[PDB]
Design a protein around this ligand. Structure first.
Ligand SMILES: *[C@@H]1O[C@H](CO)[C@@H](O)[C@H](O)[C@H]1NC(C)=O
Ligand SMILES: *[C@@H]1O[C@H](CO)[C@@H](O)[C@H](O)[C@H]1NC(C)=O
Ligand SMILES: *[C@@H]1O[C@H](CO)[C@@H](O)[C@H](O)[C@H]1NC(C)=O
Ligand SMILES: *[C@@H]1O[C@H](CO)[C@@H](O)[C@H](O)[C@H]1NC(C)=O
Lengths: 280, 100, 276, 8
């Protein structure tokens, strides 16, 4: 019927990077022609027939566009297949990166929603949110102009592991959505739960994070704190798994919470422990 | 004074297929001092629009450069790279062998 | 995983053939990203990879300032070396510098470098602890005594542990799709008869990044280094690299030999074996 | 980032 067109490794590719278009038609990566939405009936490069793949590299802004392929069907009335699914190659690095912020924060409870706000002092007409490693098209929103900044609120949820990971956002201006700015700094979205919360308690202060669930790792975080501490979980003879975080004599105190995590699961944590008050 | 004669390799960017546009490479390395003269030849004659990488060197301080130009290999035409250096009395010519 | 940033600079004198020339290049792993050439009309530090072009003008001003300063310093250093070695005004001489840092998978500092050479031979080098200098000869002992008096090692240690590491981490995120990619080697073999009783098996690795690769030949097991020809890894010119390994085998014994390819882009080592 | 450099 129709081929499957795909970009590898990613259809969102920086200028100067590399992306390969393949046209899987009829049980093989076939001979194919390529069409861009600008000229739906004219094959590109004067009807060039590509063998196996089309490696665009180094990627230029001219590579950006909305592609379809037609696979070679030698014993066909037209000799070629129906148009494929469309693949939109978006080339990035053409403006300076927007900013990406999570509201209320990057830790999202399982089953709840989070807002990913992309914004910039640059008057971007549209913004694009892209999860790293994902093949679907980036989500598009209009840049709402307000107080000299352009910005847009992406709603993500209900939070599951499939929605956690590294996000970047992009700006565009009069680009037909094919020319993108440089990517914002990466933001990691982490889902918490439904794994049971650890226990956090004081054990010259040392905080013990504990559970019988076989977490491989414990993460200690202070409310309003800069960086977390992480530590391997130690198995105890009473079937508990525990790590002891020495805070030292510097003190200053605050409110602490701890999370469990597992190996090979970077973007999910347990439910946070109850907050623990540490005295000065 | 330390003098190291260049190693020379002549090869194509992609596997050679007659009639297909490609890039002919001349990679000179391991040489010292840095003054070197590199030409890509077609039937013994210098090719004009050749480009080259910025001068750099390896951990042992020996220099390396890549010279390259766009070309279309044939069964008929014979490509080569010609290198001269203070270590060489006359230019050294290395023929392109699509098999290395 | 592991990553490196490197700056390589070359200053040459050529009396009667031109003014002294300074060329500096910057690398992240095997990818060059900046250059400066005292001969070019730019007089700027120039981008050489698309992902560094995102950096703002404050970056290029600062980098240009530091590299023009080095350009002037190392051209004067050629004149200083002439006195240290009591050499003629008429000779041509080379002065090279290498600088940079390594970081592990975590992004933390692993090891830094700052080394010089004069006319192809080691001149002075910052030791591993980034606290003392290795002077190769008698001239370099003077530079060592000078740099101890100026506390150069202390400044370079702080630079190698701070800005170098922080800059590398920043470069790796800005050029992520390029610098943190692994292109595995595309492999194949060729069979070329030498005589009727002997032939060459050549094992090919093409289009891989980064450049680090291992090509080994074995028959029925154990290294077959006996007449294992191995060309130096070479750039294809498009950002990827090439290498091949060849062994001469008795005619009819090709099935005994296997080529093994190890590369960061291959999850499991390849074993290749030729077949008619 | 380019390093600070010193005289010989
Ligand atoms: C496309 O070509 C580039 C440059 O030659 C190379 O780095 C990349 O690996 C190629 N893509 C594939 C899928 O081989
Ligand atoms: C690409 O073109 C197809 C029609 O060929 C259209 O349905 C699709 O919306 C286009 N995609 C974008 C991102 O404009
Ligand atoms: C986006 O959401 C945040 C948090 O809910 C809010 O502060 C901000 O005003 C919103 N921006 C809009 C609606 O443009
Ligand atoms: C298990 O033992 C640890 C010390 O090894 C102790 O702190 C913890 O309270 C014990 N858990 C239970 C449920 O008794």
């Amino acid at each position: 019927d129709k081929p499957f067109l795909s970009a590898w490794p990613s259809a969102v590719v920086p200028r100067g990077g590399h992306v390969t278009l393949r046209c899987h038609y009829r049980h093989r990566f076939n001979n194919f022609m390529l069409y861009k939405e600008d000229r739906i009936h004219i094959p590109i490069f004067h009807g060039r027939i590509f063998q196996e793949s089309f490696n665009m590299s180094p990627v230029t802004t001219a590579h950006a566009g909305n592609y379809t392929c037609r696979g070679s069907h030698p014993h066909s009335p037209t000799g070629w297949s129906a148009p494929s699914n469309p693949v939109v190659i978006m080339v990035t690095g053409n403006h300076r990166k927007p900013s990406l912020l999570a509201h209320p924060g990057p830790l999202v409870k399982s089953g709840e929603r989070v807002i990913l706000q992309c914004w910039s002092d640059i008057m971007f007409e549209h913004f694009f949110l892209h999860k790293e490693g994902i093949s679907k098209d980036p989500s598009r929103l209009v840049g709402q102009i307000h107080d000299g900044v352009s910005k847009a609120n992406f709603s993500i949820g209900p939070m599951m592991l499939a929605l956690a990971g590294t996000y970047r956002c992009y700006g565009s201006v009069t680009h037909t959505s094919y020319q993108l700015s440089a990517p914002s700094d990466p933001l990691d979205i982490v889902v918490t739960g439904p794994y049971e919360k650890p226990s956090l308690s004081a054990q010259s202060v040392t905080l013990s994070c504990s559970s019988r669930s076989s977490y491989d790792m414990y993460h200690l975080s202070r409310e309003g704190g800069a960086h977390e501490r992480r530590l391997p979980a130690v198995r105890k003879v009473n079937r508990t798994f525990q790590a002891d975080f020495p805070l030292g004599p510097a003190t200053h105190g605050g409110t602490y919470r701890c999370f469990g995590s597992f190996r090979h699961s970077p973007y999910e944590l347990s439910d946070p422990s109850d907050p623990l008050l540490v005295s000065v | 004074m330390i003098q190291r004669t260049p190693k020379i390799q002549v090869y194509s960017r992609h596997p050679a297929e007659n009639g297909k546009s490609n890039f002919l490479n001349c990679y000179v390395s391991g040489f010292h001092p840095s003054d070197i003269e590199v030409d890509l030849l077609k039937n013994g004659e210098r090719i004009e629009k050749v480009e080259h990488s910025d001068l750099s060197f390896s951990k042992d301080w020996s220099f390396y450069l890549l010279y390259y130009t766009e070309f279309t290999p044939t069964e008929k035409d014979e490509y080569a790279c010609r290198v001269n250096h203070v270590t060489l009395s006359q230019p050294k010519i290395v023929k392109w062998d699509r098999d290395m | 995983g592991s990553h490196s940033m490197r700056y390589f600079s070359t200053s040459v004198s050529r009396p009667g053939r031109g003014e002294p020339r300074f060329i500096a290049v910057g690398y992240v792993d095997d990818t060059q990203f900046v250059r400066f050439d005292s001969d070019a009309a730019s007089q700027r530090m120039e981008p050489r990879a698309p992902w560094i072009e995102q950096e703002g003008p404050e970056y290029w001003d600062e980098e240009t300032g530091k590299v023009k300063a080095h350009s002037q310093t190392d051209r004067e250093n050629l004149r200083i070396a002439l006195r240290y070695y009591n050499q003629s005004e008429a000779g041509s001489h080379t002065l090279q510098m290498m600088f940079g840092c390594d970081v592990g998978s975590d992004g933390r500092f692993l090891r830094g470098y700052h080394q010089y050479a004069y006319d192809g031979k080691d001149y002075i080098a910052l030791k591993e602890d980034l606290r003392s200098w290795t002077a190769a000869d008698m001239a370099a002992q003077i530079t060592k005594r000078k740099w101890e008096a100026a506390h150069v090692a202390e400044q370079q240690r702080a630079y190698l542990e701070g800005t170098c590491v922080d800059g590398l981490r920043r470069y790796l995120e800005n050029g992520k799709e390029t610098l943190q990619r692994t292109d595995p080697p595309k492999t194949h073999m060729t069979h070329h008869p030498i005589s009727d009783h002997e032939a060459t098996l050549r094992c090919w690795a093409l289009g891989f990044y980064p450049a680090e690769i291992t090509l080994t030949w074995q028959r029925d097991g154990e290294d077959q280094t006996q007449d294992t020809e191995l060309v130096e890894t070479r750039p294809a010119g498009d950002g990827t690299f090439q290498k091949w390994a060849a062994v001469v085998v008795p005619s009819g014994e090709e099935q005994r030999y296997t080529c093994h390819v190890q590369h960061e882009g291959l999850p499991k080592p390849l074993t290749l074996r030729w077949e008619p | 980032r380019y390093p600070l450099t010193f005289g010989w």
